[PDB]
Design a protein around this ligand. Sequence first.
Ligand SMILES: [Mg+2]
Ligand SMILES: [Mg+2]
Ligand SMILES: [Mg+2]
Ligand SMILES: [Mg+2]
Ligand SMILES: [Mg+2]
Ligand SMILES: [Mg+2]
Ligand SMILES: [Mg+2]
Ligand SMILES: [Mg+2]
Ligand SMILES: [Mg+2]
Ligand SMILES: [Mg+2]
Ligand SMILES: [Mg+2]
Ligand SMILES: [Mg+2]
Ligand SMILES: [Mg+2]
Ligand SMILES: [Mg+2]
Ligand SMILES: [Mg+2]
Ligand SMILES: [Mg+2]
Ligand SMILES: [Mg+2]
Ligand SMILES: [Mg+2]
Ligand SMILES: [Mg+2]
Ligand SMILES: [Mg+2]
Ligand SMILES: [Mg+2]
Ligand SMILES: [Mg+2]
Ligand SMILES: [Mg+2]
Ligand SMILES: [Mg+2]
Ligand SMILES: [Mg+2]
Ligand SMILES: [Mg+2]
Ligand SMILES: [Mg+2]
Ligand SMILES: [Mg+2]
Ligand SMILES: [Mg+2]
Ligand SMILES: [Mg+2]
Ligand SMILES: [Mg+2]
Ligand SMILES: [Mg+2]
Ligand SMILES: [Mg+2]
Ligand SMILES: [Mg+2]
Ligand SMILES: [Mg+2]
Ligand SMILES: [Mg+2]
Ligand SMILES: [Mg+2]
Ligand SMILES: [Mg+2]
Ligand SMILES: [Mg+2]
Lengths: 63, 386, 109, 172
Amino acid sequence: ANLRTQKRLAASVIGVGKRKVWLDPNETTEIANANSRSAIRKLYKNGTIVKKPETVHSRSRAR
Amino acid sequence: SHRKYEAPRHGSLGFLPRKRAAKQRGRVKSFPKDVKSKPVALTAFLGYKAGMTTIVRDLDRPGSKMHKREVVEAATVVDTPPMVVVGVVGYVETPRGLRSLTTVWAEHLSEEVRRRFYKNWYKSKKKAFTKYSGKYATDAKQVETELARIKKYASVVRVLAHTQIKKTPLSQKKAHLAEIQINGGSVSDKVDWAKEHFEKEVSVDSVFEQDEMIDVIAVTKGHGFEGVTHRWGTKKLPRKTHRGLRKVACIGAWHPANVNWTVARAGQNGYHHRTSINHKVYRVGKGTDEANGATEFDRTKKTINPMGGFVRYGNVNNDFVLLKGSIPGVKKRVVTLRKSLYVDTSRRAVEKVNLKWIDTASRFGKGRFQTPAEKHAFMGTLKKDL
Amino acid sequence: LQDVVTREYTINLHKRLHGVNFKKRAPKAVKEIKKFATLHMGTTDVRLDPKLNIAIWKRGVQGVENRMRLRISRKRNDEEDAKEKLFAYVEPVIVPSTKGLQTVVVEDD
Amino acid sequence: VRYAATPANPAKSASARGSYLRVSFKNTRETAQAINGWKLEKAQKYLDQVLDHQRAIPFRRYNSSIGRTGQGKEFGVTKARWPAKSVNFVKDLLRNAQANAEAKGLDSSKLVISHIQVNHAPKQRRRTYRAHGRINAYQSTPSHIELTLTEEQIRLNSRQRGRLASQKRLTA
RNA sequence: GCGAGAGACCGAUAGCGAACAAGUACAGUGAUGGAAAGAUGAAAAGAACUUUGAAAAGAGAGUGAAAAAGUACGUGAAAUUG
RNA sequence: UGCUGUAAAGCUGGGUCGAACGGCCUCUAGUGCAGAUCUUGGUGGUAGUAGCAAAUAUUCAAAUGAGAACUUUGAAGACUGA
RNA sequence: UAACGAGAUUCCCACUGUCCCUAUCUACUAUCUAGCGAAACCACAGCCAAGGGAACGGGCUUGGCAGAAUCAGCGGGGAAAG
Ligand SMILES: [Mg+2]
Ligand SMILES: [Mg+2]
Ligand SMILES: [Mg+2]
Ligand SMILES: [Mg+2]
Ligand SMILES: [Mg+2]
Ligand SMILES: [Mg+2]
Ligand SMILES: [Mg+2]
Ligand SMILES: [Mg+2]
Ligand SMILES: [Mg+2]
Ligand SMILES: [Mg+2]
Ligand SMILES: [Mg+2]
Ligand SMILES: [Mg+2]
Ligand SMILES: [Mg+2]
Ligand SMILES: [Mg+2]
Ligand SMILES: [Mg+2]
Ligand SMILES: [Mg+2]
Ligand SMILES: [Mg+2]
Ligand SMILES: [Mg+2]
Ligand SMILES: [Mg+2]
Ligand SMILES: [Mg+2]
Ligand SMILES: [Mg+2]
Ligand SMILES: [Mg+2]
Ligand SMILES: [Mg+2]
Ligand SMILES: [Mg+2]
Ligand SMILES: [Mg+2]
Ligand SMILES: [Mg+2]
Ligand SMILES: [Mg+2]
Ligand SMILES: [Mg+2]
Ligand SMILES: [Mg+2]
Ligand SMILES: [Mg+2]
Ligand SMILES: [Mg+2]
Ligand SMILES: [Mg+2]
Ligand SMILES: [Mg+2]
Ligand SMILES: [Mg+2]
Ligand SMILES: [Mg+2]
Ligand SMILES: [Mg+2]
Ligand SMILES: [Mg+2]
Ligand SMILES: [Mg+2]
Ligand SMILES: [Mg+2]
């Protein structure tokens, strides 16, 4: 119900910013139990936590 | 100390207080003075302000530099379907002023005038004038008794007439009911005229002729709360004045230690009752005429309506009055047209108007055609025309 | 009278947003659409599909389309206490053009 | 605890209290006076319509420089408001006193608000910061609320007697 | 300073600044400055239990000589207020 | 609730309250308040009033919860723009 | 006295709402609501005219008059406040 810690942990485990962390909205209970970085790694590996793709800055017009 | 320099006062003290009119229907404060030798006739009519147009006219004013030369003039269209006579009121001369003695009504009143007597018509049993309608039971001697009382005691007779607002494009269903004084003939003649016209329509052509000078009674355009600068036309203060400049700098001397009634103050602007006089009748149009806007020089079979209709009014499908210039009120306003209170023999009042041409281009933009036929002739075939 | 009904409407969002603060045009299109569903379905409980919110905001805070074709469904409220016996569900209709389209009853099949 | 007014028949009455309630006293006085003497069911329906802005609470004493509304015409005023926090606190106490009346066996369709009054509670102080390094008060004006639901010869002179006696003898 | 006995002294805005975790809390860079604040009841017997409420609470009940003593506690004035 | 006195005041009925207090002959004084921009404490009208307006901007849904403009998550729209 | 100057001054070109003479538009206020909620000030208060008067009255004298409760504005008076 308050996944503020899990998103902060996921950013550090994945290595991206918090703006790139996706917490499965249908797995709130499972994520809320992920109190450790070890549990965050498992959810990242399972696809419960996803690293969102980088927003594209194309250099085509500059080229 | 005195003013350093003299200037006239801003605004008129004869139009105070600058408050909202008590009613939206302008009321005839004074009717034309009654002359017995004249025939029995109405002195006023109710209409609706449709819009403004333009005409072309040859001026007949000897000694003018525009004499026998075309002038382009602004005109106002007043939609005036015939009014229905439904009642008559008798007034008695008393040392305290006129006093209404009796009001006699017609047997049948249309629904549009019976809606006048309701705030919530749709929730009502619509019981108005039903017992009165029963008063006409098989001899109608109560009505004749009241009419005889009017004949015996009344000195001023006014008819009760309502507009046929269903013939206008307005969505309002309440008719406008007003008292219109009857002038001419004896009191008995007036009462007989009123009785014989019960439930009958009276047209504008029976009240106003062309080239007449008439007065317009209306409530002007509302502007809401307004500051002194535009309400009273006072001078704006310099650009560098602290706390603002659309003010009157001095609203009074130290003494009288009060604010005077003659000082301009912010308040409600517009929506005032005005009586505007000496508007010349250029045209009393007929609703049945399919060439309302046609003249003797412009034979285009053409109604008075501009292309696309009058903006925010609609089309004038009724009889209408075409007045020179501007009259108070807004579009859709109920307008009271009153006969002149004096005899004007000046050349401006007695000139005979013959119209050359009436503008019927669109008022919704820079219209450049007078007719859809003209538009098609100018542009030719379009894609939507196939 | 059928309490459960689905119809497709065109809403003229252009005239409803006329003169509106530019940073309130997409927020007000949400309110105008809710008020639109109350007018037609008679229910003050109006729920917007999140795909409709995406379509409203697709061109930013003031890029709201002139016309949107909407599907509005009146459905029975099963909650207790609902305090509203029915509710209206509004969701977008993807059409080539939003012009010339009249109100149509959708028979859910 | 002692109520301001004791019921005439305590067996046909139920009471409720709320003390140190952090709701505007002035708003709560007006909403309490708006339902004083009403049927309980009529006041409950009325307070629901106030929360929905279908009807208003007339402000009669604490109304200086507040807005005007057409929803005050029902009560012959122009100044009326819809104080939601006060209505909710009062609805809670009407609900409580009705529960107290049900536990006594009273009939809710017969209940009437026979007594309701609002008193000042001790103020709650805060601080506001002013120009030129000044501190001012930012107090709350809380309320005490209480309510009660109640189920629905001539001696004459010698000559006065003499006149009276002699008048009887005239009437046979 | 230590140890005692007293008074036509003051009685909690008085008497020492301090009757209380008072040179305390708190302020000031610093030297220094420096409060407010006593009283349920003989005894917590400080309200078990039921009920309404999300809760705080309320209503019943209970203890007590008294709850017109419920710790927001003896009495409970005035301003001010319902 | 009244009575007495020109008065300063004294006495008394009812209510509240809970531990001391008064009359008379004298003694004594830190002995009488409407004011001092008096002191300390408390309370009003003002007044539900002034106001809560810089820093582009929020919206839909689900979850949680008695209760969600404001919490969490998702979707979007934005900004800071090294 | 060349150069320099947010120094003071006069004239000219350009420019313009500084002005003739104002009008229109935008955002934020003001406004109305829910929540929150101060302060200055306050002998008592608050309609005028004349008189006399500490010689410029809200109160006194003589007149005019005078009908609940009020909202937005306003800056004549309160010889307004500080
Ligand atoms: Mg304006
Ligand atoms: Mg300046
Ligand atoms: Mg001026
Ligand atoms: Mg035009
Ligand atoms: Mg606009
Ligand atoms: Mg008041
Ligand atoms: Mg205001
Ligand atoms: Mg107001
Ligand atoms: Mg001692
Ligand atoms: Mg002390
Ligand atoms: Mg001390
Ligand atoms: Mg004490
Ligand atoms: Mg419970
Ligand atoms: Mg006792
Ligand atoms: Mg006690
Ligand atoms: Mg006590
Ligand atoms: Mg008192
Ligand atoms: Mg006694
Ligand atoms: Mg005693
Ligand atoms: Mg004792
Ligand atoms: Mg003694
Ligand atoms: Mg002394
Ligand atoms: Mg004193
Ligand atoms: Mg003080
Ligand atoms: Mg105060
Ligand atoms: Mg305000
Ligand atoms: Mg501000
Ligand atoms: Mg979010
Ligand atoms: Mg940017
Ligand atoms: Mg030099
Ligand atoms: Mg220089
Ligand atoms: Mg320099
Ligand atoms: Mg203001
Ligand atoms: Mg004098
Ligand atoms: Mg005077
Ligand atoms: Mg004075
Ligand atoms: Mg007098
Ligand atoms: Mg002033
Ligand atoms: Mg001002």
